[PDB]
Amino acid sequence: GPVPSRARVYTDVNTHRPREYWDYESHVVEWGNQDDYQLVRKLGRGKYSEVFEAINITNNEKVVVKILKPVKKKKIKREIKILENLRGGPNIITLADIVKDPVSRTPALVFEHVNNTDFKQLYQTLTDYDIRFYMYEILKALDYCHSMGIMHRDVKPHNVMIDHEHRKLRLIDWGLAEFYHPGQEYNVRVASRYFKGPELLVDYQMYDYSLDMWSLGCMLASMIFRKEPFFHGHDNYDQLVRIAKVLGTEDLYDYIDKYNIELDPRFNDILGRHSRKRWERFVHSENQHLVSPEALDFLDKLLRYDHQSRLTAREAMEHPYFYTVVKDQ
Ligand SMILES: CC(C)COC(=O)c1[nH]c2ccc(F)cc2c1-c1cn(CC2CCN(CCNS(=O)(=O)c3ccc(CC(C)C)cc3)CC2)nn1
């Protein structure tokens, strides 16, 4: 069968913590008073939750209430446990309270409020510098959670909340995140299609934090080339097709060899032969003000089939692309 794998960094971080740190199944939830919050207006909805602006009538503080739809109790315990473990880390959304409606009995998480409502315009007026800066803030959060033994597994634009007025950014929706344990085999059905890593697409289950680094690359690429989504895949098979027509197929079959991955016979007829394209081809007159040698050298080191050879968050944070942002701080 397939050749095993381990994270290059933070490998045994959880082995060294006490059991309860990662054994979320045994975590008991500190519920609270659902009557301290009142819903003002709805802010969004998704397959696993509906999000409201709310006010804590205890302190007048405005707040975000995320009402969970039916999942397994352990999935909830998982999100709750990861959020508490990460509370206070750089640019992690703060879980404030945990309440359950008395009659409905649907659980809900209560978070610090981050002012977004600005995204659409902000998305197409970020300067080259804004992008470097906000990418640096994301990496701060990824490095933290990785060092804390946690994969996010759903890195993507909509899971980043930016109040540009206060250059403030939080990484949200930890519903998909797990703890990394060496030699564990994880579910490949995670993350949005356009951001799924090659390991998930070919069904290699012993993946790790470097999965988030791939998704960062896709985020970065669409921002700097002004192409959303970058890898515009019709479904999970054609998404590996779309990657291969940029990264080339030779590096892909090398990846498959090295880890002795068993390709779904479906891919046989659709992966083709494709050379590895030069990034220059995505550069046109309307995005070139966000494209630079440093940005492309950076991008190329995130988007590798071989998850072991992608930049780690800390390593990313040191790349030349970020010299100017680091100099300001
Ligand atoms: C929606 C549910 C399905 C799940 O919800 C939550 O789980 C949730 N949980 C919260 C906790 C606290 C809270 F305060 C809100 C929330 C929310 C929550 C969710 N939505 C909805 C969208 C959130 C993202 N918006 C813009 C995208 N990011 S963006 O513009 O800021 C940007 C800029 C630029 C980039 C480029 C990079 C260089 C950075 C990327 C992203 C669109 C609206 N609203 N609130």
| Helical segments of 259-322, H only | 293-302, 313-317
Q: How many CB atoms lie within 10 A of CB 262?
A: 12
Nearest Cα residue to atom 3 of ligand 1: 46
Compute, in angstroms, the gap from residue 47 CA to the centroid of ligand 1.
15
After which residues, if any, is the chain broken (C to N > 2.5 Å)?
A: none
Exposed, middle or buried: residue 50 (CB in 10 Å: 0-12, 13-18, 19+)? middle
Question: Measured between alpha carbons, how far is residue 130 from residues 6, 319, 325 in Å?
Answer: 34, 16, 9
Pairing of strands 61-68, 49-56: antiparallel
Q: Is 29 annotated as a binding residue?
A: no
Residue carrying structure tokens 């509906």: 50
> Is there a contact between 227 and 259 (Cβ–Cβ < 8 Å)?
no
Q: How far apart are CA 311 and CA 302, in angstroms?
A: 6
193 SS3 class: helix
Angle at 175 between CA 174 and CA 177, to 5 degrees: 65
Q: How far apart are CA 203 and CA 271, in angstroms?
A: 15
Q: How far apart are CA 288 and CA 297, in angstroms?
A: 15
Who's near 115: CB < 8 A, 6+ residues apart? 163, 165, 166
Experimental determination approach used: X-ray
Exposed, middle or buried: residue 199 (CB in 10 Å: 0-12, 13-18, 19+)? buried
Per-residue DSSP letters for 44-103?
Answer: EEETTEEEEEEEETTTTEEEEEEEEPS--HHHHHHHHHHHHHHTTSTTBPPEEEEEE-TT
Q: How far apart are CA 36 and CA 50, in angstroms?
A: 19
Residue carrying structure tokens 């950076």: 298
Compute, in angstroms, the gap from residue 210 CA to the centroid of ligand 1.
22
Compute, in angstroms, the gap from residue 110 CA to the centroid of ligand 1.
15
Q: How long is the chain?
A: 329
Per-residue DSSP letters for 34-55?
Answer: GGGEEEEEEEEEETTEEEEEEE
CA 51 to chain centre: 19
Of 37, 40, 41, 51, the residue with max ligand 1 atoms within 8 A of its CB, to mutate for a pocket test, comes to: 51
Angle at 87 between CA 83 and CA 88, to 5 degrees: 155
Give the side-chain half-sphere CA count within 13 A for 325: 21
> Is there a contact between 92 and 170 (Cβ–Cβ < 8 Å)?
yes
Question: Could you tell me the domains of the chain?
Answer: 31-112 (3.30.200.20), 119-328 (1.10.510.10)
